[PDB]
Design an enzyme around this catalytic site. Structure first.
Site, PDB file in Angstrom:
ATOM      1  CG  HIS A 105      -0.405   0.270   2.531  1.00 21.23           C
ATOM      2  ND1 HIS A 105      -0.318  -0.723   3.487  1.00 21.23           N
ATOM      3  CD2 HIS A 105       0.012   1.408   3.141  1.00 21.23           C
ATOM      4  CE1 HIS A 105       0.162  -0.216   4.611  1.00 21.23           C
ATOM      5  NE2 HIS A 105       0.382   1.073   4.424  1.00 21.23           N
ATOM      6  N   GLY A 159       3.057   5.394  10.358  1.00 22.93           N
ATOM      7  CA  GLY A 159       4.441   5.301   9.944  1.00 22.93           C
ATOM      8  C   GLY A 159       5.122   4.001  10.312  1.00 22.93           C
ATOM      9  CB  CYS A 182       2.983   0.285   7.490  1.00 22.27           C
ATOM     10  SG  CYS A 182       1.318   0.307   8.128  1.00 22.27           S
TER      11      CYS A 182
HETATM   12  C1  7VB Z   1       1.443   2.130   7.913  1.00 26.04           C
HETATM   13  O1  7VB Z   1       2.517   2.945   8.417  1.00 26.04           O
HETATM   14  C2  7VB Z   1       0.143   2.351   8.686  1.00 26.04           C
HETATM   15  C3  7VB Z   1       0.289   1.818  10.107  1.00 26.04           C
HETATM   16  C4  7VB Z   1      -0.985   2.138  10.868  1.00 26.04           C
HETATM   17  C5  7VB Z   1      -1.112   3.626  11.163  1.00 26.04           C
HETATM   18  C6  7VB Z   1      -1.636   3.703  12.598  1.00 26.04           C
HETATM   19  N1  7VB Z   1      -1.340   2.401  13.164  1.00 26.04           N
HETATM   20  C7  7VB Z   1      -0.944   1.520  12.240  1.00 26.04           C
HETATM   21  O2  7VB Z   1      -0.604   0.378  12.448  1.00 26.04           O
HETATM   22  N2  7VB Z   1      -0.963   1.656   8.025  1.00 26.04           N
HETATM   23  C8  7VB Z   1      -1.942   2.306   7.387  1.00 26.04           C
HETATM   24  O3  7VB Z   1      -2.009   3.531   7.371  1.00 26.04           O
HETATM   25  C9  7VB Z   1      -3.012   1.493   6.691  1.00 26.04           C
HETATM   26  C10 7VB Z   1      -2.936   1.614   5.158  1.00 26.04           C
HETATM   27  C11 7VB Z   1      -3.659   0.485   4.426  1.00 26.04           C
HETATM   28  C12 7VB Z   1      -3.185   0.037   3.280  1.00 26.04           C
HETATM   29  C13 7VB Z   1      -4.910  -0.170   4.939  1.00 26.04           C
HETATM   30  N3  7VB Z   1      -4.307   1.973   7.131  1.00 26.04           N
HETATM   31  C14 7VB Z   1      -4.735   1.661   8.352  1.00 26.04           C
HETATM   32  O4  7VB Z   1      -4.054   1.013   9.126  1.00 26.04           O
HETATM   33  C15 7VB Z   1      -6.114   2.114   8.729  1.00 26.04           C
HETATM   34  N4  7VB Z   1      -6.915   0.930   8.935  1.00 26.04           N
HETATM   35  C16 7VB Z   1      -7.896   0.572   8.115  1.00 26.04           C
HETATM   36  O5  7VB Z   1      -8.296   1.262   7.176  1.00 26.04           O
HETATM   37  O6  7VB Z   1      -8.512  -0.715   8.392  1.00 26.04           O
HETATM   38  C17 7VB Z   1      -9.762  -1.031   7.780  1.00 26.04           C
HETATM   39  C18 7VB Z   1     -10.888  -0.146   8.276  1.00 26.04           C
HETATM   40  C19 7VB Z   1     -11.566  -0.460   9.455  1.00 26.04           C
HETATM   41  C20 7VB Z   1     -12.606   0.366   9.879  1.00 26.04           C
HETATM   42  C21 7VB Z   1     -12.971   1.488   9.139  1.00 26.04           C
HETATM   43  C22 7VB Z   1     -12.299   1.798   7.961  1.00 26.04           C
HETATM   44  C23 7VB Z   1     -11.264   0.977   7.533  1.00 26.04           C
HETATM   45  C24 7VB Z   1      -6.096   2.940  10.015  1.00 26.04           C
HETATM   46  C25 7VB Z   1      -4.984   3.984   9.985  1.00 26.04           C
HETATM   47  C26 7VB Z   1      -7.449   3.593  10.282  1.00 26.04           C
END
Ligand code: 7VB
Ligand code: 7VB
Lengths: 301, 301
Positions: free
Chosen positions: B41, B138, B140
């Site tokens: 992603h 950040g 991830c």
């Molecule tokens: C990468 O650095 C980050 C790490 C994340 C930020 C905060 N804590 C963490 O572990 N990851 C992301 O930003 C990812 C990107 C992706 C490709 C999905 N996004 C998330 O982690 C979001 N989560 C999410 O969208 O899960 C599904 C969901 C659930 C409920 C409602 C909407 C979507 C998160 C930051 C909200």
């Protein structure tokens, strides 16, 4: 989010760990520049360490850096640590400092056996100057430390286990934390207390992470809270502790004395089958800094 | 003695951590030989990652190993991870394996931001294929791992946070643990259970460490224990789990089914204001191996 008991990355310390063998004792040493630091009780034969060390020669000390042998070219005692001068400077020596910590502060421990790291964990220096570590025979010489950007502040070297299964050791100048001596005569930890400012820090961590059930609008004065603290064997809270909690109070919008009123109620009532950050006890081994570091994401290198 | 939640030394992994920036996303990558692995992603613009990746060129990917820049010379997708071929092989590449773990197993997490390690902690893969980590934006691309002598078995790469504050990610082949997808559509963790064999392991750790108050001579059959397990949302105990606990049973002299009877009573009665290894809850994130490793002192390098 989430909240874990989190240690510093240990790589910088792993590269300093060596094995020190003398007579039939093997333990760990810390290799910085051309000196290896280790507990003086490695020395052979109710002991008199000055007696024992003059009878000792450089070649009695077998120092092993992984596989490579380290030639000892001098030795001296500094309080309860031995300083072994070797003919090679550790090329992996980090930027470092020797610092002595205060009761209530936390640090990471790199537990080692035979000069090889086994695991890393976090703990606190207890008010009674012991630490609740995880140490088996052969672990002496393992060190505790903190990292600030690229600099390792060594604060602890492991020496002994007390009868309650808690641990005692020195700073890196060889001076014991607390009223302990490196003799195998009968010694006891002394009564401990709970680190109040850390419990409050951890409650702020819980709020930052969505645990809010323990909150209220009951407030309290610092004086009235400290009467409750004394009753439950908690350390007094000072105006300095209140100031230190300022940033966490600002972040969450919960005044420090308001969180004190929450802690008062938790102390008087219990948790009533509920948990806070996955614990059923009030946790006191996270400092305000530990909370900010872990809920703002500070890194190191 | 003592018992701590203890992570593996992280040095070997620290040397593999790099920063990957593409468009406006920055996250962490894992640099092994001449490949950098990171969450797909990172790629720019409900997504179609095959669409997005063909529009991408090598020079879009900014890879930074500390200060040194890494030239990307190829890219490909593998399930939910991106493999960035770079023109330099990481000279710090450890002996490594890519392994997928089972629910109930533990591993160490090296939490990283901008390619720099922040901290290390231990956790378990939950029965519902989430982990209870500590991760901020950040993070991830941070990885989880185990070490066996000198070999790093990478088992986890971090991708997302679910609404209950728990975390989801992939193995290093890019395949998610559990029924999660790397889309920001609504997803939920699913009901969890307690890892019974680990709770029993931790009770053996407590006995090895001098906590014996929960012991009894009430015994039980495996069948009768599993009726109690189901009622308290504990996973079934198998004859294989009983066998795995054999060594700890032999060390302590407490038969596995006898410890099950202790756990039955703890489940039905509570702890009555007492603690076990410093916890007021039954701990399930220590495997039998974790207990043996930490109460026999196994090292690594
Ligand atoms: C990468 O650095 C980050 C790490 C994340 C930020 C905060 N804590 C963490 O572990 N990851 C992301 O930003 C990812 C990107 C992706 C490709 C999905 N996004 C998330 O982690 C979001 N989560 C999410 O969208 O899960 C599904 C969901 C659930 C409920 C409602 C909407 C979507 C998160 C930051 C909200
Ligand atoms: C060094 O590797 C070991 C580490 C120790 C072994 C088990 N867990 C540990 O942390 N340290 C020692 O063996 C030291 C040696 C020393 C110079 C004192 N000895 C101990 O730790 C003993 N502790 C001890 O003697 O404390 C005082 C005491 C208290 C009560 C009765 C008698 C003596 C310990 C192994 C018994």
């Amino acid at each position: 989010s989430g909240f874990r008991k989190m240690a510093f990355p240990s790589g910088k310390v792993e590269g300093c760990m060596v094995q020190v063998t003398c007579g039939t004792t093997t333990l760990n040493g810390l290799w910085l520049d051309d000196v290896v630091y280790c507990p003086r009780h490695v020395i052979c034969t109710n002991p008199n360490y000055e007696d024992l060390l003059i009878r000792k020669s450089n070649h009695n000390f077998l120092v092993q850096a992984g596989n490579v042998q380290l030639r000892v070219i001098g030795h001296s005692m500094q309080n309860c640590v031995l300083k072994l001068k070797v003919d090679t400077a550790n090329p992996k020596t980090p930027k470092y400092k020797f610092v002595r910590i205060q009761p209530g502060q936390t640090f990471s421990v790199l537990a080692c056996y035979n000069g090889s790291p086994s695991g890393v964990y976090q703990c606190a220096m207890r008010p009674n100057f012991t630490i609740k570590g995880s140490f088996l025979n052969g672990s002496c010489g393992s060190v505790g430390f903190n990292i600030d950007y690229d600099c390792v502040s060594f604060c602890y070297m492991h020496h002994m286990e007390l009868p309650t299964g808690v641990h005692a050791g020195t700073d890196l100048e060889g001076n014991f934390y607390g009223p302990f001596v490196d003799r195998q005569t009968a010694q006891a930890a002394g009564t401990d207390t709970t680190i109040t400012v850390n419990v409050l820090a951890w409650l702020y961590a819980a709020v930052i992470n969505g645990d809010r059930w323990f909150l209220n609008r009951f407030t309290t004065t610092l004086n009235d809270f400290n009467l409750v603290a004394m009753k439950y064997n908690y350390e007094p809270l000072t105006q300095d502790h209140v100031d230190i909690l300022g940033p966490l109070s600002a972040q969450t919008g919960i005044a420090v004395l308001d969180m004190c009123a929450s802690l008062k109620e938790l102390l008087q009532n219990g948790m009533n089958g509920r948990t806070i950050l996955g614990s059923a006890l009030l946790e006191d081994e996270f400092t305000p800094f530990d909370v900010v570091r872990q809920c703002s994401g500070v890194t190191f290198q």
